[PDB]
Amino acid sequence: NPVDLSKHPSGIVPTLQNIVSTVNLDCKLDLKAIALQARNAEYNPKRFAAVIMRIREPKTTALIFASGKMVCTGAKSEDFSKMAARKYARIVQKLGFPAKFKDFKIQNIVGSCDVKFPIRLEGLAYSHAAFSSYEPELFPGLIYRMKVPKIVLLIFVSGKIVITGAKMRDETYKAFENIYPVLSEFRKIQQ
DNA sequence: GCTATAAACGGGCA
DNA sequence: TGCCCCTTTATAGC
């Protein structure tokens, strides 16, 4: 609630919007059995090899594979992603699979924020051509590939920003603080 | 729906 | 190894 200015000298804190984590349930799973018995689980192996299962709290989607690997998507924080993963693991256990909870790992963190002024994207693409891809007839946002940390930002004329590719939220924050002074150089008036 | 980004998974191609 | 999918999420123009 007090913004730590040593991590956010802009004074702006990106909001986390999506976490991807993995965990190894460490046993073989009968996906047809799981899809039949579990209420909110779909399975079309012709299309995709996973059982797709969804829970309401934390609101998430798991991809559960016959190998015992699981991907958990959609949570708003690292803690919520781990808590959701444990709930999916318990669902599988309650069906009689002896599932464990091995090597849980946060794999991707997506954040977004709003610098609250419009941005002349053409100018940023021009001066940062090596890191920028801006093709407004293909997609209206500028794609910025930051090297340190290795992070991708989507930058929009509105001042909204998407920040993805982090394994640690401090990478999300560092990328935003690296880009904020650059964005400010291309601020334009809002009609 | 399409177009754009990252990551994991199993799985098609080379 | 790479390519192409696969779900999720913010963003936003056709």
**Pair (A101, A30) in one structural domain:** yes
Any strand C atom closer than 7 Å to A164 CB: yes
DSSP state of A111: E
Any strand C atom closer than 7 Å to A45 CB: no
Look at residues A62, A82, A106 and tell me which one is the last residue of a structural domain.
Answer: A106
- Protein residue nearest nucleotide B6, by CA to C1': A165
Nucleotide showing the shortest C1' distance to residue A165 CA: B6
Type of residue found at A70? M
Count of domains forming chain A: 2
| Interatomic CA distance for residues A103 and A24, integer angstroms | 6
Q: A100 is written with which tokens?
A: 């464990």
Question: Do A162 and A96 meet the contact criterion of CB atoms below 8 Å apart?
Answer: no
DSSP H or E stretch at residue A78: helix A78-94
- A67 in a structural domain: yes
Closest CA to A170 of A149, A152, A153, A184: A149
What does the buried/exposed string (b/e) look like for A146-180 if buried means 16 or more CB atoms within 10 Å of the residue's CB? beebebebbbeeebebbbbbbeebebbbbbbebbb
- A16 in a structural domain: no
**Pair (A54, A86) in one structural domain:** yes
Nucleotide showing the shortest C1' distance to residue A110 CA: C9
Look at residues A60, A89, A106 and tell me which one is the last residue of a structural domain.
Answer: A106
CA torsion through residues A57, A12, A110, A161, sign:
positive
